[PDB]
Design a protein around this ligand. Structure first.
Ligand SMILES: *[C@@H]1O[C@H](CO)[C@@H](O[C@@H]2O[C@H](CO)[C@@H](O[C@@H]3O[C@H](CO[C@H]4O[C@H](CO[C@H]5O[C@H](CO)[C@@H](O)[C@H](O)[C@@H]5O)[C@@H](O)[C@H](O[C@H]5O[C@H](CO)[C@@H](O)[C@H](O)[C@@H]5O)[C@@H]4O)[C@@H](O)[C@H](O[C@H]4O[C@H](CO)[C@@H](O)[C@H](O)[C@@H]4O)[C@@H]3O)[C@H](O)[C@H]2NC(C)=O)[C@H](O)[C@H]1NC(C)=O
Ligand SMILES: *[C@@H]1O[C@H](CO)[C@@H](O[C@@H]2O[C@H](CO)[C@@H](O[C@@H]3O[C@H](CO[C@H]4O[C@H](CO)[C@@H](O)[C@H](O)[C@@H]4O)[C@@H](O)[C@H](O[C@H]4O[C@H](CO)[C@@H](O)[C@H](O)[C@@H]4O)[C@@H]3O)[C@H](O)[C@H]2NC(C)=O)[C@H](O)[C@H]1NC(C)=O
Ligand SMILES: O=C(NC[C@H](NS(=O)(=O)c1cccnc1)C(=O)O)c1cc2cc(CCC3CCNCC3)sc2s1
Ligand SMILES: *[C@@H]1O[C@H](CO)[C@@H](O)[C@H](O)[C@H]1NC(C)=O
Ligand SMILES: *[C@@H]1O[C@H](CO)[C@@H](O)[C@H](O)[C@H]1NC(C)=O
Ligand SMILES: *[C@@H]1O[C@H](CO)[C@@H](O)[C@H](O)[C@H]1NC(C)=O
Ligand SMILES: [Ca+2]
Ligand SMILES: [Ca+2]
Ligand SMILES: [Ca+2]
Ligand SMILES: [Ca+2]
Ligand SMILES: [Ca+2]
Ligand SMILES: [Ca+2]
Ligand SMILES: [Mg+2]
Ligand SMILES: [Mg+2]
Lengths: 457, 219, 452, 214
């Protein structure tokens, strides 16, 4: 029979709006006293209430900041719109749009191990060229690159190390009447930095050392380059690539016994404050299994960039350390670069919306529309995004009655993104006719006070 | 049984060259250093040089650098000494030597090879009987003079070796490219001239065998 | 089936001495068994590491052992216009110790050596050397067959041919029954590897102190090669002897080459002239196939069988995942003029990083059933990783997959319990053979006894 | 070049004696010394290497001693086989260098020589030459001096001398001396003489002949 608007006290226009979103109030004094003022808008117009006198506020959104999404490092707009103004009435809700897009480049770390043994003398230009091309081309591919490097030779101990004459220690090249650097196990040289100018300069500074046997201690460098988190400075939320260069075969676990080294590799970080691998002369080379374990654990991809003469060797090793790949080190750096581009090509990401500072009274609900173009209701996150991809959500916010705060704001931020949507919320609870209060009763005249929208107290 | 078997005695000409051999028996020549050593009566012993036949490397005394070339051949287990530009100073006995255990030692020697440098031609010896002079004691000494022969050796006996006792045959001596030798025999006075004491020289190099009966001297 | 795990005996060396790195049973002239233990990091009398050897007599209680004395003084000889030099500091004396008749041969694989000549040198390099001892007489001899007096440059001029400077002679060692000592030198010939052999008798009779370079005329070294397959192969990392050609008159040698052919690894069987009779290729790279080799007849047919240890072998598992557990390979010898074939059995470890097959010890006939038995070491095996030695009884079909008995390290983590093993000797004279296990990390040796 | 001075150059000793030979290097040679034996007419045998070590098979009675630059070989209880020559060799430096030698000689009583003078044979004279021979036989010690006089005037050129080794029976020595001159001169003089001087007599033994006196 009757509706909720009429059948609930309704002394005022404000109490009328307080009942339900579908209620309207009739300010018109020409209306007969038999008619109810608080009713449906259908009923008011039906009961001769002048359409000009009807109070019936409708909730709305408003695109205040609506800059477009970016394409292809200046401003970078990934969320859009940035600012919406919601204006709600008691109990009522309102919906609005939002578009997220992956514009920013993906974070990639590249640590670079340089074999600086004397055999690499003729290969030196190649590893400097490869390093400086890796740095340069990857920077073009991703502005969020970080790059660093270290060098290795072999365990500085007899028989690997020349231990005579005494001068040969500081200068392993002594018996050739030429000078080169003293031997070392593993030396960390440059922590993962975003300074490509600096990286390329330090890489070009490097010179070779010398040792006795062809197989080198690069696997020490891999193990320390993996497990030494703080020293190398891998980022948690970033893609990890460890590039290994050499022109010869490598020592493996149980080789150390020829230097009298029998203690197995603990797979721990022993690169202290002086950036040298302090366990080089006291601990055996790591086994393939231990490397596989720590590479996996620290979430790092190994790339062997070896010269042609040993590609087949490291290819075979690569098959025993799943997920490893092998490129060819040479005067041309294309082969190895492709491996990294291909690694970058695989990086997928996700847009996961999160709401900050949502008032007690408000409550949101989302419909996600992802790459597949299907509105999954209740979901607020999309997966499998490449650079350039855009996803879209529909948010709806419902206010609980009418709060006294009247103006609050809350944010809708995608996790991982610096961009967000600030939504400013006004709570419209009054009627426009309340502005004309007219303090003096005039009609009531019994100390009632005020007369608004055609009514006493 | 380690044993070094050197080559036979060489008669050679001044200016020419000679090559001496030393062949390992009971071992392999590559097992150790092999040295060559020169020996002469007056001057004594001189180290010429060594060779490591595994790899042919050699060392020499500056004195013999230019004259001596030491070589070896593992296929035939033999070491070699070659002496160029032979002079009369090269007339010596030459030995090859090797160690027992100590790398640097000189423990096992070859029997030695004799080298004689000379322009002389083969010459048969003049053999002269030496009878005593014109009173007489109770024991008599006779003698035999072998002169102007080359090369050595001669083999001198008395009564075809019947009379061995009381004999003194002296070592040959060189003078002007030809050797001279002498021998004395002493018997009692009753033995000679009553019985016949003949001298017997033999020089194989010129196929000569001469007998000289010692006869007493007359007025 | 019957090594008593409760009634153990512990022999203990000094701290950091690696007492039990190597070991062997030794028998005096009267017939009494004792134990030789090598301790490669023992300090010398002047507080510098030289290594040492101890000769323990059998005791149920065990305890501390007496030191078998050796000359630890460095030597110089100015001879033949050169300077010969021995350097015993950090030589690792007792990194391998083998017994024969009334002799002990303890080796210092990392003994260094140099020769100076004017401003030139041979280079200070680890030639290795073995010290021989005849305890009941007191005689001592040495054997250092890789020492040379060739200068650095001459090797360079000859493309490093016959370069024995880095031999590490005695790295591994074995003696034939006739008394031919055989030394593994994996650094020989610029890390190809070589074997040197000589009669014990002749080593003794040709040794004199102070000589440094001397000749053992009866010795026989293996050959240099330019075949890249052998490069960096460490041929002689392990060595053993046995009968593999039917001719009882000749002796065959088994050599370990764990990094042979680009870390594939191999084990070869040779005659006493170092001619190849058969080769056994490793299965998986870097597994160190040839770390350990053992010779014994396990199927009771009178023909020796072969056991090879690949302790870093990685077994396949669900989702393409590899797991380093170690592996021992058994090759039974067939009849007639037939070579060894594929493995008759593969024994894989179960503990990750356990290094199963790091040691393989013939036990003789542990349970006296007719078939010889063996022990296989997993030095970091067992659920806790403290170490494990597994017994395997022999049988007509070869060996058992299931071990007959497992022995757990009684020493703390790190002991390397199992890294050395020796058996087939009745130490207590109860009719059953026993097993001594070394734990160099703990500086101790456990003795297990066989019981009816 | 290291110089090896060996002492004495010879010694006269008897069976059963313990003798020692000394060898002095020009500089230290830290025991890098060998001792060698050369028996009469025979080749070499090694006695000692590296100062004190006997070569395999060398009898116990031989022993090496010394250090630095001064070394000694000792033979104890001399055997008749041990009467030979002995040399030291050093091998501290190349070139290897040898000692002068030491000769072990059999001691015996002093004996004056039996001197015999022989004029030219008839065969030699008719051929054109003339040699006067003199045998100085069975004497001890080995040192002896012969002198020739033609008519009492000392003749110096054309003399040829030859000494035998120590006799295997009576341990004495002997010496032949042959003066050769032209037959033409030989027949120009009368008295020919050979005078032996030896320690066994302060005045010499004079044997002569006068040419054509029969
Ligand atoms: C996320 O996406 C979802 C999906 O699009 C979206 O859902 C809509 O939500 C709004 C409210 O926000 C709903 O509005 C209500 O509509 C009620 C009528 O619903 C019935 O009729 C619908 C139309 O039916 C015809 O047409 C369609 C298509 O042509 C066809 O399916 C029918 O056969 C028929 O021909 C129909 O879509 C709807 O079907 C859904 O609901 C049933 C019931 O549970 C469900 O079982 C089905 O599976 C199906 O999902 C249904 O049959 C209407 O009664 C209601 O009105 C009352 O409430 C409002 C206030 O809320 C008062 O104003 C009014 O006075 C009444 O009291 C209300 O209007 C709308 O129906 C949904 N649409 C669909 C398709 O599900 C979410 O809003 C999205 N969220 C965000 C944040 O964006
Ligand atoms: C990296 O890993 C690869 C793959 O394992 C190694 O390459 C293999 O090496 C093995 C040697 O262990 C080779 O085995 C030999 O195969 C020969 C014939 O193979 C043909 O068929 C393959 C198809 O897979 C072709 O690709 C190949 O070109 C050939 O046409 C046999 O003739 C050989 O037999 C001889 O040796 C064996 C023992 O090894 C004896 O048992 C035989 O009696 C005989 O004497 C042998 O079986 C194999 O060919 C290689 N595979 C491939 C695909 O090339 C690399 O060596 C390794 N590299 C490094 C650096 O570690
Ligand atoms: O790369 C090497 N050494 C390490 C190199 N140091 S280095 O560049 O100075 C160098 C290079 C070559 C040789 N020695 C050292 C470096 O510092 O990178 C090589 C070592 C050797 C040794 C060789 C001899 C092989 C033997 C095998 C048996 N047959 C006889 C020959 S070949 C090589 S490469
Ligand atoms: C929002 O919901 C309203 C319901 O009044 C509907 O008309 C409109 O299509 C929706 N728009 C968006 C952008 O969600
Ligand atoms: C060795 O090690 C322990 C702990 O490091 C030390 O306390 C003890 O003195 C040593 N033990 C022996 C038996 O020397
Ligand atoms: C075995 O052969 C060797 C080598 O030829 C030989 O010297 C030896 O006499 C033989 N031994 C037997 C017992 O037949
Ligand atoms: Ca190179
Ligand atoms: Ca190296
Ligand atoms: Ca055989
Ligand atoms: Ca068998
Ligand atoms: Ca059994
Ligand atoms: Ca027992
Ligand atoms: Mg290198
Ligand atoms: Mg190599």
């Amino acid at each position: 029979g009757p509706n909720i608007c009429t059948t609930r006290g309704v002394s005022s226009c404000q109490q009328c709006l307080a009942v339900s979103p579908m209620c309207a109030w009739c300010s018109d004094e020409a209306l007969p006293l038999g008619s109810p003022r608080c009713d449906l808008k259908e009923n008011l117009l039906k009961d001769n209430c002048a359409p000009e006198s009807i109070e019936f506020p409708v909730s709305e959104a408003r695109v205040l900041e609506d800059r477009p999404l970016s394409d292809k490092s200046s401003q970078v707009t990934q969320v859009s719109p940035q600012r919406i103004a919601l204006r709600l009435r008691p109990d009522d809700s309102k919906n609005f749009s939002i578009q997220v897009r992956q514009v920013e480049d993906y974070p990639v770390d590249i640590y670079y191990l340089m074999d600086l043994s004397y055999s690499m003398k003729d290969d030196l230009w190649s590893i400097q060229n490869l390093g400086t091309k890796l740095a340069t081309q990857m920077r073009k591919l991703t502005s969020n690159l970080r790059i660093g490097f270290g060098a290795f030779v072999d365990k500085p101990v007899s028989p690997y190390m020349y231990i005579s004459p005494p001068e040969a220690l500081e200068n392993p090249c002594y018996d050739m009447k030429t000078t080169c650097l003293p031997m070392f196990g593993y030396k960390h040289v440059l922590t993962l930095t975003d300074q490509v100018t600096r990286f390329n300069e330090e890489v070009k500074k490097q010179s070779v050392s010398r040792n006795r046997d062809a197989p080198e201690g690069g696997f020490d460098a891999i193990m320390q380059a993996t497990v030494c988190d703080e020293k190398i400075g891998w980022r948690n939320d970033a893609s990890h690539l460890l590039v290994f260069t050499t022109d010869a075969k490598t020592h493996i676990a149980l080789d150390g016994r020829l230097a009298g080294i029998v203690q197995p590799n603990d797979g721990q970080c022993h690169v202290g404050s002086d950036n040298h691998y302090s366990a080089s002369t006291t601990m055996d080379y790591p086994s393939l299994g231990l490397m596989t374990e720590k590479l996996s654990q620290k979430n790092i991809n190994l790339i062997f960039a070896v010269t042609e003469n040993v590609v087949n060797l490291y290819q075979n090793y690569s098959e025993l350390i799943p997920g490893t790949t092998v490129g060819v080190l040479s005067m041309d750096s294309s082969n190895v670069l492709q491996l990294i581009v291909d690694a970058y090509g695989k990086i997928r990401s996700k847009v996961e919306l999160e709401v900050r500072d949502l008032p007690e009274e408000l409550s949101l609900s989302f419909n996600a529309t992802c790459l597949n173009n299907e509105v999954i209701p209740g979901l607020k996150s999309c997966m499998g995004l490449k650079i350039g991809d855009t996803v879209s959500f529909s948010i709806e916010a419902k206010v609980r009655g009418c709060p006294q705060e009247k103006e609050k704001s809350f944010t809708i931020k995608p996790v991982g993104f610096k961009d967000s949507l600030i939504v400013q919320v006004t709570f419209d609870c009054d009627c426009a006719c309340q502005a004309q209060a007219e303090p003096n009763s005039h009609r009531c005249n019994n100390g009632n006070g005020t007369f608004e929208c055609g009514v006493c107290r | 049984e380690v044993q070094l078997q050197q080559s036979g005695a060489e008669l050679v000409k001044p200016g020419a060259s000679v090559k001496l051999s030393c062949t390992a028996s009971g071992f392999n020549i590559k097992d150790t250093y092999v040295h060559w050593v020169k020996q002469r009566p007056e001057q004594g012993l001189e180290w010429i040089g060594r060779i490591d036949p595994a790899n042919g490397y050699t060392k020499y005394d500056p004195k013999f650098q230019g004259k001596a070339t030491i070589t070896a051949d593992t296929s035939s287990n033999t070491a070699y000494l070659q002496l160029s530009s032979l002079t009369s100073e090269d007339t010596a006995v030459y030995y090859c030597v090797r160690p027992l255990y100590d790398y640097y030692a000189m423990d096992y020697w070859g029997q030695g090879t004799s080298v004689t440098v000379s322009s002389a031609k083969t010459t048969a010896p003049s053999v002269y009987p030496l009878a005593p002079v014109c009173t007489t004691g109770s024991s008599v000494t006779l003698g035999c003079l072998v002169k102007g022969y080359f090369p050595e050796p001669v083999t001198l006996t008395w009564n075809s070796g019947s009379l061995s006792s009381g004999v003194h045959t002296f070592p040959a001596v060189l003078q002007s490219d030809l050797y001279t030798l002498s021998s004395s025999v002493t018997v009692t006075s009753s033995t000679w001239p009553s019985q016949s004491i003949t001298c017997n020289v033999a020089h194989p190099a010129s196929s000569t065998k001469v007998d000289k009966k010692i006869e007493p001297r007359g007025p | 089936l019957n090594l008593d795990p409760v009634q153990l005996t512990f022999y203990a060396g000094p701290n950091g001495s690696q007492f039990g790195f190597s070991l062997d049973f030794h028998k005096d002239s009267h017939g009494r068994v004792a134990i030789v233990v090598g301790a490669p990091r023992t300090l010398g009398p002047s507080q510098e590491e030289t290594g040492g050897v101890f000769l323990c007599p059998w005791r149920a209680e065990g305890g501390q052992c007496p030191s078998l004395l050796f000359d630890l003084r460095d030597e110089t000889r100015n001879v033949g216009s050169q300077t010969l030099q021995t350097f015993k500091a950090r030589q690792g004396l007792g990194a391998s110790v083998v017994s024969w008749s009334d002799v002990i041969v303890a080796c210092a694989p990392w003994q260094h050596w140099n020769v100076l000549e004017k401003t030139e040198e041979a280079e200070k390099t680890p030639v290795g050397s073995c010290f021989l001892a005849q305890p009941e007489s007191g005689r001592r001899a040495e054997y250092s067959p890789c020492r040379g007096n060739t200068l650095s440059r001459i090797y360079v001029e000859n493309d490093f041919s016959w370069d024995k400077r880095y031999c590490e002679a005695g790295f591994s060692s074995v003696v034939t029954q006739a008394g031919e000592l055989v030394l593994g030198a994996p650094g020989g010939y610029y890390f190809l590897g070589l074997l040197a052999q000589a009669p014990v008798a002749d080593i003794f009779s040709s040794y004199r102190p102070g000589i440094l370079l001397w000749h053992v005329s009866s010795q026989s070294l293996s050959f240099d090669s330019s075949n890249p397959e052998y490069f960096d192969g460490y041929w002689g990392y392990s060595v053993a002897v046995g009968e593999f050609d039917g001719d009882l008159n000749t002796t065959e040698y088994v050599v370990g080459a764990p990094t042979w052919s680009w870390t594939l690894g191999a084990v070869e069987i040779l005659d006493s002239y170092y001619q190849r009779l058969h080769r056994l290729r490793g299965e998986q790279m870097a597994s160190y196939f040839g770390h350990s080799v053992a010779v014994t007849d396990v199927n009771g047919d009178g023909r020796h069988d072969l056991l090879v240890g690949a302790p870093l072998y990685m077994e396949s598992r669900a989702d393409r995942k590899l797991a380093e557990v170690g592996r021992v390979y058994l090759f039974l010898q067939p009849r007639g003029p037939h070579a060894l074939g594929a493995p008759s059995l593969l024994l894989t470890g179960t503990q990750l990083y356990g290094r199963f097959g790091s040691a393989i010890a013939p036990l003789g006939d542990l349970d006296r059933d007719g078939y010889n038995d063996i022990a296989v070491a997993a030095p970091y095996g067992g659920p806790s990783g403290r170490g494990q030695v597994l017994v395997f009884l022999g049988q007509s079909e070869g060996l058992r997959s299931r071990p007959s008995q497992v022995l757990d390290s009684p020493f703390p983590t790190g002991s390397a319990f199992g890294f050395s093993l020796r058996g087939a000797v009745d130490i207590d004279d109860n009719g059953y053979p026993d097993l001594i296990v070394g734990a160099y990390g703990a500086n101790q040796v456990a003795v297990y006894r066989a019981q009816p | 070049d290291i110089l090896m001075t060996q002492s004495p150059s010879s010694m006269s000793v008897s069976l059963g004696d313990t003798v020692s030979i000394t060898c002095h290097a020009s500089q230290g040679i830290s025991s890098n010394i060998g001792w060698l034996q050369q028996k009469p007419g025979k080749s070499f045998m090694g006695l000692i290497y590296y100062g004190t070590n006997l070569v395999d098979g060398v009898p116990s009675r031989f022993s090496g001693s010394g250090s630095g630059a001064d070394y000694s070989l000792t033979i104890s209880s001399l055997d008749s086989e041990d009467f030979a020559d002995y040399y030291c060799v050093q091998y501290a430096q190349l070139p290897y260098t040898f000692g002068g030698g030491t000769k072990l000689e059999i001691k015996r009583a002093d004996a004056a020589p039996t001197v015999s003078i022989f004029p030219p044979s008839s065969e030699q004279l008719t051929s054109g030459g003339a040699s006067v021979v003199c045998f100085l036989n069975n004497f001890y010690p080995k040192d002896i001096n012969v002198k020739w006089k033609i008519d009492g005037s000392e003749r110096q050129n054309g003399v040829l001398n030859s000494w035998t080794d120590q006799d295997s029976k009576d341990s004495t020595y002997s010496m032949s001396s042959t003066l050769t001159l032209t037959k033409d001169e030989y027949e120009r003089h009368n008295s020919y003489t050979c005078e032996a001087t030896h320690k066994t007599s302060t005045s010499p033994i004079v044997k002569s002949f006068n040419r054509n006196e029969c």
